[PDB]
Amino acid sequence: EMPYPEVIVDVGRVIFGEENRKKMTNSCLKRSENSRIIRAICALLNSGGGVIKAEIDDKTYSYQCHGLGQDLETSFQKLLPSGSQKYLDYMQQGHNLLIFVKSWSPDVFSLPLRICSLRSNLYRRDVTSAINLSASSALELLREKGFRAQRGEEEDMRILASEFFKKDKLMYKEKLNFTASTHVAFKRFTTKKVIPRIKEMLPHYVSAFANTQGGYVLIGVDDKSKEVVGCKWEKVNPDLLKKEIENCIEKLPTFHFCCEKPKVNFTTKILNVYQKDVLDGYVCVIQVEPFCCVVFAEAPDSWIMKDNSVTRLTAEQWVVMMLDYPIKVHKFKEALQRHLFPVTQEEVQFKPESLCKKLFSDHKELEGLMKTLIHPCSQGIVIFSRSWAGDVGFRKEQNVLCDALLIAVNSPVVLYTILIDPNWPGGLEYARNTAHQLKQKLQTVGGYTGKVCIIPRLIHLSSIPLRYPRSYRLADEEEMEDLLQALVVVSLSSRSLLSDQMGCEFFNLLIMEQSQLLSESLQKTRELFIYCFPGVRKTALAIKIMEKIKDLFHCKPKEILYVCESDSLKDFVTQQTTCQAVTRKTFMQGEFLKIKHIVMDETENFCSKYGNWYMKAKNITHPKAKGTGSENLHHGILWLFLDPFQIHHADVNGLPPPSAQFPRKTITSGIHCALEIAKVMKEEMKRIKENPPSNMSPDTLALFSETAYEEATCAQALPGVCETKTNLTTEQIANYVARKCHSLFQCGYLPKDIAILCRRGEDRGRYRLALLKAMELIETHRPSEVVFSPATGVWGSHIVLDSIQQFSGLERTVVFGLSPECDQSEEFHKLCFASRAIKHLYLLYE
Amino acid sequence: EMPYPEVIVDVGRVIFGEENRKKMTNSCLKRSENSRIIRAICALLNSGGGVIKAEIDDKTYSYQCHGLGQDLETSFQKLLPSGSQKYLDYMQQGHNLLIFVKSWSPDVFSLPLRICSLRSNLYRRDVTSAINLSASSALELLREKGFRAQRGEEEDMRILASEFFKKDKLMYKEKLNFTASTHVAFKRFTTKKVIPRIKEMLPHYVSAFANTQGGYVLIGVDDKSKEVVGCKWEKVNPDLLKKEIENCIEKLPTFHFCCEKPKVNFTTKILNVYQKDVLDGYVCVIQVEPFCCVVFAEAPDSWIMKDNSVTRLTAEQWVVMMLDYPIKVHKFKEALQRHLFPVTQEEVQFKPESLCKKLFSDHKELEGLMKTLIHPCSQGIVIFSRSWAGDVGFRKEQNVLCDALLIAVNSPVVLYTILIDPNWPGGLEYARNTAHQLKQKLQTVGGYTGKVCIIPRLIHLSSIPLRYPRSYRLADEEEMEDLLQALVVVSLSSRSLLSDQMGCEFFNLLIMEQSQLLSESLQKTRELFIYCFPGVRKTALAIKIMEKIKDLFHCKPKEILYVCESDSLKDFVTQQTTCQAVTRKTFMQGEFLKIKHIVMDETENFCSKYGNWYMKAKNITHPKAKGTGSENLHHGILWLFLDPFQIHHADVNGLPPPSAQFPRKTITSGIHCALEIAKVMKEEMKRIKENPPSNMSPDTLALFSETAYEEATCAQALPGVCETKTNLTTEQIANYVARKCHSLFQCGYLPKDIAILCRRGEDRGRYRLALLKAMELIETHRPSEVVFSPATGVWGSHIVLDSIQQFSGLERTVVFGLSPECDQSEEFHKLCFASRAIKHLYLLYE
Ligand SMILES: [Zn+2]
Ligand SMILES: [Zn+2]
C-alpha cells in the first residue's frame, strides 16, 4: 500500500496556489494552514530531511498554470536566509502534491548554524526598538555571554530615571525629561484586561534589558514626546498589576552558563499621583537588574518533529542544539574513491566481484537478463550485495537473496529486490526500509550535502513506479564523485562485507602517511629503538620505509636487508618489497659481507641456548668503515622493532642488560584492528599491569601510558564484529562448530579471506582431525569440496587451518577459534588471538 | 585654533532632531543630507575611526529634550546588523554637535567582515524576487564562486521557454504558459524613454541569472497571470532597444577569479508579432549565459574616505577588501602585561624608572608639583617618555622635554607636554599629532577593540579642554588590562626605549617555551648534537633546561655541570643558575669525579695544541657505571652546542673527524636579534656560501638551508635601528665619534645598557684611550664624569668598553663600532657585529 521510501508527514487540504494566496479574505484558516505548513516543512528540514505529502485544492490544478504566489514564498525566504534553491523542490501527482527537503547541513563557506529557526526568541534593545534576533545574532550573543560567564547624554539620563524610581509622590501629566535610550523603556498599555498584555509585552523587554544593559520599564506614559496622560481612577487601580506581574515573570524559560544560578531580580513598585486633592492617574514601575545569562521570551521557534508527529522544543533543548575513524576518513576519502570506485566513460561495472562469482555459480539464470534489466547504458556502477539494511545495521530477512544499488549520471539511484518465494506482503515493506536507512546514513555519517533519492523496486527473478523532480538525479562527474565518497565513509562505519573490502585500502593510505613521518626522522637519527604496542602492524610499516631509504640514500635495492624469525613471515616479506629477507636460523647463519644497513622485525624471538644475536649484529655492522684504516666514515642504520608488552621469551637477548636503551621512538600512531578487537586488548592489557607474571620485568611498563589507547584507538580503528560462545567441551563442540561457519562464505567472503585459528598448536595434526572431517559433516548442505593446507598456509585461495604460533605477523579478516580449558592459571592465550584478526573476530573461549 | 586630536569631517547644517525627522515635507534636501550623513559615517567606520563634527538645527537645541528620531536610527540599524551599541556615541557643544565612531574590527565570535557595506551591489535570483545581498551572503557567494573557479515540474520550464527563444514569429496577446522560476524572469516596462530604465533595471537581473543559474530576460509581458498586452507600433519600435542595451551591459564592473577572462555572453535577438495583417506590438528577448565569476550591478556602497574628503570605491578595489613578532606577541601578551604593567589598588606608579631618575636629576622642579598636577588618586599608571610621536615614528622636535601618557580607571587617557621656550604656535600643532598617531596604532595592529581617547594638553612647567561621552574612559580592571595589553603590542613594533624595555621580557617568555619543547626530548634521547645559527642565544636556553633536568631526574642541584671557554661567559653563568661553571682552561684542569651529566656551551672553541678536549670528555663521562663490575647502568647526558657557521679554529677538535654525527637537532626556532640586524646576517651569510675560505669545510653547509630563516626571523625578531657611516679614518673619526654618542643616554637609555665595541682586539693600549680621552671631549656639554672598566666589564653600571673576542656570548642592547681598513682580503669583522647586538645597532665601517 503506497510504496514510498521516506518520512511522510500527512498534512491535508492546504493550498499551494496563487488564487487562494491572493483571494482569501477568511484570514483565520489561511494563517492556520500557513503556520501548519511552515511548521511541518521546518520540522522535517531540521530533523533529518525527507518528503512532504500534501493534497490538491482545485480539480484542474497544475503547477505551471498557477505558479506559487507571494505569501508562502516570502515566508520561505525569511525562513531560509542563505539560499532557498538547495532545499526546496516541488512536484504534483494526481490528487497529490509532493515537496522535498534535505538535511540542514551548512557548507564550510558559511557560519555554522546547526538548526535553523524562524525567530530565535531572544529579544534585544536597540536605540528605540525591541528587536527579535536572527540565528547569527543569537549565536554571537550566546557565545559572548558564555565567554563572559566563563571569565568571571548617552550614559547621562540613565541616572535621571533613578529620581523617577525613588519618587513615590508625582505630579500629574509631568513630562519628565528622560527619554528612550539603551537603559530605559517606557511602553504603556491602558486596556481593560491588563493581564495577558504583560505576558505578550515584557518577556521581550525583560530579556532586552538583560542581554544588553541595565533596566527600567514603565506603565502609564505616552511615547510621542515623553508625555504622561494618566487615566481615570475607576479604569485603572493600584492593585490589579502586582498580582499578575509576578505570575508573568516566573515562567520564562531560562538557560544558565554558570552554576551559582540566580533569578531575575524583579523590583516592581507602584507610584501614586496627588495634585490639588484630585487624582487623575498613576504610574507603575518595574526594575530589572542585568542578568548573568540568557533569558528567553517564549518557547523557541525551532520546530523538530518527533513520534511521527509535529513537536515543539524547549529552551534547554534549544541551546544544546544551537551550540555544539572520524577524522582521517574525511581526509583520505578522495584517494579511496579514485582507487576503489573509479568513475570514467567505460561500460557499467559490477563492482563487488566476490559476490558475482557466487551468484553466477549457483544461479546461472540470475546473472543473465539482469544486465538487460537495468538499461542499455555505459556510465554506471552496480553495487550488488545481500541485504543492505542488514549491511548498514538491521535484522536480516530469511527469504531475500540479493539486491542491487545502481549509481549513474543521468539516472536516479534505485534499489531492486530479488525474492525467491512469492511473499508479496512480506517483501515490499522490507524494500521500503532499505530506501530510508541507507539515505539517512549517507546524509548524516557521510556528509553528502547533495540531493539524492533511492527508488524501491522488486523484480522476483526466480522465474506503479514513483517520480522524482529531475534534480535529485546526479548531474556530472563531480556529483557522482561526492556520492561515491559519502558511500565510502558510510561503508567504513558498518559491519558488512564492503567494509572489509575498503578497510585494507584505508589501512594502506594510513601506512603511507606514517612511513612519511618516520622517513622524516630518518634524516636526523641513524639508530632508533622502536617500542610498539600489540596491534601495531610493524610488518606493513617496515616495507614503505625501504623505498624512502633507497630514494634518499641513492643506493642499490639489494643493499638493504631485513631480519625475521620463521619461514612464515619470511614469506609475504620475500614479495611486496626488494630486500634480502632471512630467518633467525639464517641471519645467524648467513655471512653477509656486502651488507650496508639493517631494518629488522620481530625482535622478541632470539634464543640464547645456541649462539648469540645481539653480539653478532653488533659485530657485523657496528664494525663498519671505522678505525684509522679508512677515512670514509659512512654510518649505518639499525632500526629494531620491539614489542615489549608481548615479550614471551625468557632467554636474554642482550637488550635487557642495557634495558634496550638508545634514541627511542614509541610509535603510538600505528594501530590496525577492529574497534572491539582493540577493546578486548585494552581490557586484557590492564590485567598484566595489575598482576605481572613470574618472568616479566615490570620496569618496561613505564613507557606505556594510559589514554594512549582510546585516542589512538579512537583515531585509527574501524568497527566490526566480536562474538563469544560458552560451555563447549571438545565432545560438545564436535557438531556445534560446523554450523556457524557454513553460512559465512555465501555473503561474499572468499575462502582465502577466512582462517580457522586453534589454541593448542602442539596438537596440530590432531587438529587436522576433529575439524576437517567435521567440516565435511557440514559440507553435506551445498555440493562442493574444501582443502585445508597448513604447510603452504599463506597464499592459498583455500581455507587455511592455522595456529597462533604457526601463523604469526601476517593478518587476515575473519579469524575463528577453539579452546579447551587447559590450565586454571595460564590465561595468556587470549593475548594471542586478537593480535591477528582485523575486523571480524569469532572467538569460542571455553 | 580648536585643539582636537582626530580626523574631523566638516559636514554642515544637518539635523539630528525628531522634529525635522517627522516634519520635513521637502524630501529632496532631507534625503540628500541623510545620504551625506550615512556616507560620511560609514566612511569613517570603514577607514580608520575618528570623530565627526556637525552643526546645530535649532537655536535652543538639546539632545535630551528632542531625542533622536526614527529614520536616521533605522538607517543606522540597517547599516549595523550585529550591534549599534558599540560604535555610536553622541554629544552637543554650543553651536556644534559631535558624533563619535570606532574602527570596524569584528570580534572572534562573529563572521569576519573586514569592511561593512550598506548594500553589496550583487543581486541574486530567488523564487520570484531579485533580492540584494547583505555582506554575509555576498561573502559566501564570493567564497563559493572562488572555490568553484579554483576547482575546474519546475526544471523543464527552462526547456519549455526555448520555443519562445527560437520562434522568430508570434501571434498577439497569447498567454504562453511559462512563469517565474529559477531560470526565467520576465520583468517588463513600457515607458517612453526606454534607455535609462535598462541601465537601472537589468544589471540586477544580469547579476541574478549569473550567480545562480541560467538566464532569460523579456520586455513586454505582464507579471500578473503571464499576460501579453503589447503596445501600439507608434509607441514601441523594433529598433530603439538594441542600440543601447549593448551600451548598458558593457560598463558593469567585473571581478575575475579565472584566467581566460570572458565577457558576459549576451545573445539577444528582437522578435515581432503579425496577426491578420493588424500589428499590435512585439516582445524583445535577452539571453544571458551563466557567468563564471561575479558581476556587480553598479559601484559598491562600501564608502571609504580619502584625501580628507569622501570617496567612492570600485569593484576591484572592493573584492580585495571584502576578502582577505606577528603571532607570538598576541599569545604572550597577557604574561607580558601582568608582569610589566601590573594593575592593582595601590598608589600611582611612575613606571619607566630610567627617565624619572634623570628628570629629577637635571630639572628637579619638574618632578615636584607634577604629582599634584594630575589628581589626588591611586589607581593608575603614568608612562613618562621623550617625544611620543618620535617613539611611534615621526620627526622629533628640538625643544620638547617630556610628555605624560596617563592611564586610569575612571579617568580618560590624556597627554600633556613639557616645554621650555615660549613657542605657542609650535606647541599645540605638536600636541594634536600624537593623540592621532598613537590611537591609530592601538586600534589597528596593537589590536584594541575598545573605546579610548587621548586628550592633548600643555602645561609649560618653567617653574579650553575638550569633552568625551563618558564611555571612552575605562570601566574596570579588564578594560585597563586590554589597553595595557594592546600598548605592549604597539611598543613592541617601534624603535623606542620602552621597546627595548619590553623586548627583554618577551625574549625570556619565549625561552621558556623553547626550553619546554627541548625538555620534551629528555625522555627520548640521552645524547644530542645541536647545530645552531648565528644569533641563537644558546646561553639563555642552556639555563632553563637544568631545572627540567632536576625536576625530572630528582637529583641534587650540584650534579649538573657547564663548560665554557673564557672567564667572561663564566661570569653571568656563575649567577642566574645553580651549576658548576668552568672555563676551557678549567674543565681541562679540574678533576670532577662526582659529576654524572654534562650540559656544555660554546663547543666551537677548543685548542688542540697542548692537549685534547673531546678525548678527555669521552674518557670522563663515557666510562660511567658500565662493564661487568657494576650492575647499575644509569646513562648520562652529553649535550654539545655547536655553532657550525661561525667556527674559525681549524685544529683537530674531535667534532670534524666524525663530522660531529650523532642524534641531531638543528634548532631553527631560536633567534633573538632585531628585524634589521638579522637582515645584515642574512645578507652576510650567503657570501660565505658562494665564496668559502681556504680553512673552512664546505661539508657542513648542507644543514643550513635558505628559507630556514624568513620564518624564524619573521617569527622571533623585533623592529629596531641600524645605521652606517662612511670615510672616518682614525684622524677624521677622532672628533666625529664623540658627538653621536652623547645624546643617547638622555633619551632614556640607562647606563650598563650601551657599550662601545671596538674591532682591533690587540691594540687595547691604544683603544683604552683615544676614545676615553675623546669621551670627555664631549662631556663638556653636561657637567658629569665617565668611568670605563673593561676588566670587570660585565656587571658594572658604568659604560663598558669591550672587544669582539673579549666580550662574547653576553648581549647588550646598544652596540657601537670603529673599524679602520685592515686588509683587502679580511672581510670577516662584519660577521662579528650582529651576533652581539639586540635591537640598536650602530656601525661605522671604514
Ligand atoms: Zn549564570
Ligand atoms: Zn572568469
CATH architecture, domain defined by A525-673+684-703? 3-Layer(aba) Sandwich (3.40)
- The CA-based diameter of chain B, rounded to the nearest angstrom, is 124
Closest CA to A316 of A142, A106, A133, A113: A142
Q: Which residues of A are annotated as a binding site for ATP?
A: 532-539
Measured between beta carbons, the chain A residues lying within 8 angstroms of B470 are 154-156
Measured between beta carbons, the chain B residues lying within 8 angstroms of A475 are none
How far B179 CA sits from the closest chain A CA (Å)?
A: 7
Contacts of A402 (CB under 8 A, 6+ apart): A355, A359, A366, A384, A385, A386, A418
Minimal Cα distance from B91: which residue of A? A153
Q: B611: exposed, middle or buried (C-beta count within 10 Å: 0-12, 13-18, 19+)?
A: exposed
Please tell me the total number of residues recorded for chain A in this structure: 846
- H helix or E strand, kind and range, residue A200: helix A195-211
Q: Are A402 and A386 in contact (CB under 8 A)?
A: yes
How far B59 CA sits from the closest chain A CA (Å)?
A: 18
Amino acid making up residue B653:
N
Q: Are A678 and A671 in contact (CB under 8 A)?
A: yes
Helix axes B329-340, B477-491, angle to 10 degrees: 120
Quote the CA–CA distance of B817 and B844 in Å, as a whole number: 6
| Residue found under cell 633573538 | B672
A124-300 has which fold? 3.30.950
Chain breaks in chain B (C to N over 2.5 A) after: 152, 324, 463
- The answer as to CATH 3.40.50 being correct for domain B525-673+687-702 is yes
Quote the CA–CA distance of B221 and B185 in Å, as a whole number: 10
Kindly provide the b/e burial profile for residues A388-418, where b requires at least 16 CB atoms within 10 angstroms of the residue's own CB. Answer: bbbbbeeeebeebbbbbbbbbbeebbbbbbb
Locate A114 and state its grid cell. Answer: 546547526
Sheet bearing A217-219, strands edge to edge: A217-219, A283-286, A269-271
Resolution in A: 3.4
Strand A51-54 relative to strand B349-350, pairing: unpaired
Quote the CA–CA distance of A257 and A147 in Å, as a whole number: 9
How far A153 CA sits from the closest chain B CA (Å)?
A: 6
How far B469 CA sits from the closest chain A CA (Å)?
A: 7
Quote the CA–CA distance of A790 and B298 in Å, as a whole number: 80
β-strand partners of A661:
none
Q: What is the DSSP letter of B446?
A: I
Measured between beta carbons, the chain A residues lying within 8 angstroms of B525 are 663-664
- Mind giving me the DSSP string for A761-804? GGGTTTTTSSSHHHHHTTSSSSS------STTTTT-SSPEEEET
Quote the CA–CA distance of B299 and B302 in Å, as a whole number: 9
Measured between beta carbons, the chain B residues lying within 8 angstroms of A137 are 81-82
Contacts of A472 (CB under 8 A, 6+ apart): A89, A100, A412, A451, A452, A453
- Mind giving me the DSSP string for A371-395? HHHH-S-SSEEEEEES-HHHHHSSP
Q: Are B804 and B764 in contact (CB under 8 A)?
A: no
Measured between beta carbons, the chain A residues lying within 8 angstroms of B469 are 153-155
User: Where exactly are the structural domains of chain A?
Assistant: 18-100, 124-300, 329-502, 525-673+684-703, 720-846
Contacts of B781 (CB under 8 A, 6+ apart): B742
Facing residue for A111 by CB, picked from B81, B111, B129: B111
How far A826 CA sits from the closest chain B CA (Å)?
A: 32
Chain breaks in chain A (C to N over 2.5 A) after: 152, 324, 463
Minimal Cα distance from A531: which residue of B? B524
Asked whether the CA dihedral B338, B339, B345, B350 is positive or negative, the reply is negative
Interface test with B, best of A91, A154, A451, A635 (most B CBs within 10 A): A154
Radius of gyration over every alpha carbon of chain B, rounded to an integer in angstroms: 37
Query: What is each CA distance from B6 to A153, B306, B438, B608, B672, in whole angstroms?
Result: 21, 15, 11, 68, 37
Ligand whose nearest atom lies closest to the CA of A254: 1
Q: Are the Cβ atoms of B177 and A144 closer than 8 angstroms?
A: no
Q: Are the Cβ atoms of A661 and B526 closer than 8 angstroms?
A: yes
Closest CA to A249 of A190, A218, A207: A207
Quote the CA–CA distance of A568 and A804 in Å, as a whole number: 12
Distance spanning both ends of chain A, measured CA to CA = 50
Measured in whole angstroms, the distance separating CA A563 from the mean position of its chain's CA atoms is 41
Q: Is B273 annotated as a binding residue?
A: no
Residue A449 CB-half CA count within 13 A? 7
Interval between CA B263 and ligand 2 midpoint (Å): 9
Minimal Cα distance from B83: which residue of A? A126
Determination approach: cryo-EM
Give me the total of CB pairs closer than 8 Å, taking one residue from chain A and one from chain B: 135
Q: Are A833 and A674 in contact (CB under 8 A)?
A: no
Closest CA to B334 of B449, B444, B484: B484
Q: Which residues of A are annotated as a binding site?
A: 532-539
Q: Are the Cβ atoms of A81 and B180 closer than 8 angstroms?
A: no
Measured between beta carbons, the chain B residues lying within 8 angstroms of A157 are 64
Q: A227: exposed, middle or buried (C-beta count within 10 Å: 0-12, 13-18, 19+)?
A: exposed
Quote the CA–CA distance of A834 and A822 in Å, as a whole number: 19
Distance spanning both ends of chain B, measured CA to CA = 51
Query: What is each CA distance from A679 to A643, A674, A687, B2, in whole angstroms?
Result: 19, 8, 13, 78
Q: Are the Cβ atoms of B470 and A156 closer than 8 angstroms?
A: yes
Query: What is each CA distance from B253 to B247, B256, B480, in whole angstroms?
Result: 13, 10, 46
Residue A687 CB-half CA count within 13 A? 11
Phi and psi at B639, nearest 5°, equal -100, 110
Q: Are B415 and B456 in contact (CB under 8 A)?
A: yes
Facing residue for A147 by CB, picked from B81, B90, B109: B109
Interval between CA B432 and ligand 2 midpoint (Å): 48
Radius of gyration over every alpha carbon of chain A, rounded to an integer in angstroms: 37
Locate A98 and state its grid cell. Answer: 509532493
Quote the CA–CA distance of B104 and B112 in Å, as a whole number: 11
Q: What is the DSSP letter of B442?
A: I
Measured between beta carbons, the chain A residues lying within 8 angstroms of B128 are 68, 70, 73
Q: Are A627 and A587 in contact (CB under 8 A)?
A: no
Measured between beta carbons, the chain B residues lying within 8 angstroms of A147 are 109
How far B715 CA sits from the closest chain A CA (Å)?
A: 23
Torsion of CA A349, A350, A354, A359, to 10 degrees: -150
Quote the CA–CA distance of A96 and A91 in Å, as a whole number: 9
Quote the CA–CA distance of A453 and A472 in Å, as a whole number: 6
Closest CA to A640 of A701, A597, A599: A599
Amino acid making up residue B230:
G
β-strand partners of B71:
none
Count other Cβ atoms within 10 Å, centred on residue B520: 10
Measured between beta carbons, the chain A residues lying within 8 angstroms of B175 are none
Q: Is B532 annotated as a binding residue?
A: yes
| Residue found under cell 549509481 | A407
How far A92 CA sits from the closest chain B CA (Å)?
A: 7
Q: Is B832 annotated as a binding residue?
A: no
Strand ranges, E, within A446-588: 454-456, 527-531, 561-563, 580-582
Q: Are the Cβ atoms of A92 and B153 closer than 8 angstroms?
A: yes
Quote the CA–CA distance of B445 and B493 in Å, as a whole number: 9
Q: Are the Cβ atoms of B524 and A663 closer than 8 angstroms?
A: yes
| SS3 track for B301-339 | CCECCECCECCECCCHHHHHHHCCCCCCHHHHHHHHHHH
Locate A782 and state its grid cell. Answer: 551445498
Quote the CA–CA distance of A330 and A720 in Å, as a whole number: 19
Locate A502 and state its grid cell. Answer: 575498503
Closest CA to A413 of A380, A377, A371: A380
Tell me if B525-673+687-702 shares its fold with B720-846.
yes
Facing residue for B177 by CB, picked from A65, A73, A659: A65
Contacts of A836 (CB under 8 A, 6+ apart): A757, A804, A807, A808, A810, A811, A812, A815
Q: What is the DSSP letter of A312?
A: B
- Mind giving me the DSSP string for B708-731? SSSSSTTTSEE--EEE------TT
Facing residue for B90 by CB, picked from A85, A143, A153: A153
Query: What is each CA distance from A451 to A32, A73, A93, A342, in whole angstroms?
Result: 30, 21, 20, 21
Facing residue for B153 by CB, picked from A64, A157, A665: A64
Outline where A523-566 has alpha helix (H). 538-553
Interval between CA A207 and ligand 1 midpoint (Å): 14
Count other Cβ atoms within 10 Å, centred on residue B652: 12
Measured between beta carbons, the chain B residues lying within 8 angstroms of A144 are 107, 109
Q: Are the Cβ atoms of B154 and A664 closer than 8 angstroms?
A: no
Count other Cβ atoms within 10 Å, centred on residue B21: 19
Measured in whole angstroms, the distance separating CA B775 from the mean position of its chain's CA atoms is 40
Q: Are the Cβ atoms of B665 and A111 closer than 8 angstroms?
A: no
Q: B726: exposed, middle or buried (C-beta count within 10 Å: 0-12, 13-18, 19+)?
A: exposed
Locate A115 and state its grid cell. Answer: 538548526
Locate A121 and state its grid cell. Answer: 526568541
Q: Are the Cβ atoms of A154 and B90 closer than 8 angstroms?
A: yes
B720-846 has which fold? Rossmann fold (3.40.50)
Interval between CA B261 and ligand 2 midpoint (Å): 5
Count other Cβ atoms within 10 Å, centred on residue A517: 11
Quote the CA–CA distance of A11 and A19 in Å, as a whole number: 20
Q: Are A136 and A113 in contact (CB under 8 A)?
A: yes
Quote the CA–CA distance of B813 and B831 in Å, as a whole number: 18
Q: Are B831 and B648 in contact (CB under 8 A)?
A: no
Q: Are A844 and A737 in contact (CB under 8 A)?
A: yes
How far A432 CA sits from the closest chain B CA (Å)?
A: 25
Closest CA to B634 of A531, A658, A663: A658
Contacts of B660 (CB under 8 A, 6+ apart): B529, B640, B642, B644
Outline where A523-631 has alpha helix (H). 538-553, 567-570, 584-587, 614-620
Quote the CA–CA distance of A698 and A681 in Å, as a whole number: 19
Quote the CA–CA distance of B181 and A88 in Å, as a whole number: 12
Locate B628 and state its grid cell. Answer: 661487568
- H helix or E strand, kind and range, residue A714: helix A712-716
Strand ranges, E, within B770-836: 800-803, 812-815
Interval between CA B388 and ligand 2 midpoint (Å): 49
Quote the CA–CA distance of B405 and B341 in Å, as a whole number: 14
Closest CA to B388 of B506, B523, B487, B471: B487
- Mind giving me the DSSP string for B730-749? TTTTTTTTTHHHHTTTTTTP
- H helix or E strand, kind and range, residue B581: strand B580-582
Please tell me the total number of residues recorded for chain B in this structure: 846
Q: B589: exposed, middle or buried (C-beta count within 10 Å: 0-12, 13-18, 19+)?
A: exposed
Minimal Cα distance from A82: which residue of B? B137
Quote the CA–CA distance of B252 and B288 in Å, as a whole number: 14
Interface test with B, best of A96, A125, A127 (most B CBs within 10 A): A127
Ligand whose nearest atom lies closest to the CA of A258: 1
Outline where B152-257 has alpha helix (H). 157-160, 162-165, 195-211, 242-248
Strand ranges, E, within B337-477: 349-350, 380-385, 400-408, 413-415, 418-419, 454-456
Helices (H) and strands (E) in chain A, counts: 25, 24
Residues with CB under 5 A from ligand 2 (ion): B 256, 258, 292-293
Locate A768 and state its grid cell. Answer: 587436522
Closest CA to B544 of B580, B518, B583: B518
Quote the CA–CA distance of B724 and B760 in Å, as a whole number: 19
β-strand partners of A128:
none
Locate B655 and state its grid cell. Answer: 667534532
CATH class of the structural domain B123-298: alpha beta
Closest CA to B461 of B364, B542, B587: B364
Q: Are the Cβ atoms of B664 and A524 closer than 8 angstroms?
A: yes
Ligand whose nearest atom lies closest to the CA of B295: 2
Facing residue for B109 by CB, picked from A77, A143, A179: A143
Interval between CA A822 and ligand 1 midpoint (Å): 62
Q: Are B562 and B592 in contact (CB under 8 A)?
A: no
Q: What is the DSSP letter of A289?
A: P
- Mind giving me the DSSP string for B655-670? STTTTT-SSEEE--S-
